[PDB]
Design a binder for this molecule. Sequence first.
Ligand SMILES: CCC(O)(O)CCCCC[C@H](NC(=O)C1CN(C)C1)c1ncc(-c2cc3ccccc3nc2OC)[nH]1
Ligand SMILES: [Ca+2]
Ligand SMILES: [Ca+2]
Ligand SMILES: [Zn+2]
Length: 367
Amino acid sequence: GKKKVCYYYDGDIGNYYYGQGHPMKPHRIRMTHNLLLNYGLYRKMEIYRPHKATAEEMTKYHSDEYIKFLRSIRPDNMSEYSKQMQRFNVGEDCPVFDGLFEFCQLSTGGSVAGAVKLNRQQTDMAVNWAGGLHHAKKSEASGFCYVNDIVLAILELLKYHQRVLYIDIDIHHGDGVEEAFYTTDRVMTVSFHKYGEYFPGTGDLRDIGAGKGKYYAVNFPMRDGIDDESYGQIFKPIISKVMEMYQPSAVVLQCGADSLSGDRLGCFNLTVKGHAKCVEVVKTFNLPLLMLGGGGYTIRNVARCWTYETAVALDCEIPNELPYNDYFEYFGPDFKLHISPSNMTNQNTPEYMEKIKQRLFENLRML
Ligand SMILES: CCC(O)(O)CCCCC[C@H](NC(=O)C1CN(C)C1)c1ncc(-c2cc3ccccc3nc2OC)[nH]1
Ligand SMILES: [Ca+2]
Ligand SMILES: [Ca+2]
Ligand SMILES: [Zn+2]
């Protein structure tokens, strides 16, 4: 039936700024929040302010040296850490900005607090739109991500769950999460992503895990222009087979919105309904679920996507006519919640989609 949803948000998150021209805009988290408050969704869910995750929490995965560096680096002392910045991949994609560590602490705090709430059986779903920073590595920042809140939240779930399923619908491969759990069967990682001349360059369908983790990493490489019809026809069958074979007791779903049509960095053609169908599919399995954010660089569409996905989590129908909100002008010229796909060609032929699905099904038979 309808589920209890706990949602995490810190009113300060929108003020962190990656710098002029940087596509990552934490302000999109505040737009999302303001839009869902204006739809009245706060009447149906418990809203929590995450704590600032500590160094003890972050070093459950990250090295002590990398966390010490993130805690120390500031725009005023950057000149003294030139060597350390290179070592930890802090620079152009992952800049040093005022309050960087606190931004990591809030992003991580929401994901870890949500996993604790799920472990305690105090909620059916936990939502942290400021989380989902799937590229961060044990001792390195990558692709706008510094602390891997997902790996930390999964480690928390593993205290009570023998098997955890991670699903990543961001247009980019979930490499940091896959890497962390590559050699274990206690976490199965499933990523759908654009593959070929695209960041991070990993996620080939032939990357299936190693050692005890062999067959516990699943990658669905896609080409430009995938649409709702093509995505929907492979997502439900793959996730259904994974659920059947793997039998997880908890799920983490990274909802990166850069897989939507019109994304500044993405080249897919999904609508908000097509992206949210992934949430609907995962919800039907009735397992404790942690829903996280991720990419999304056309910020009006990120706010629409995550507002609608929160409504889906709540089984709450919301009107297409957008309510007035603090960012109303960002949603012009239509002022509607739902988006239209573009006329871009879908390079993912139906035969290509079926063939990759069949190749992944062969790997799932090995569980
Ligand atoms: C949250 C989860 C997520 O998965 O959504 C993150 C996506 C991360 C994409 C990183 C990618 N980095 C690479 O290609 C690099 C180069 N090589 C050495 C690795 C990428 N694309 C686009 C950008 C990009 C980065 C910028 C940085 C500063 C200013 C403008 C910028 N303008 C940009 O683009 C207009 N940088
Ligand atoms: Ca992905
Ligand atoms: Ca694994
Ligand atoms: Zn992305």
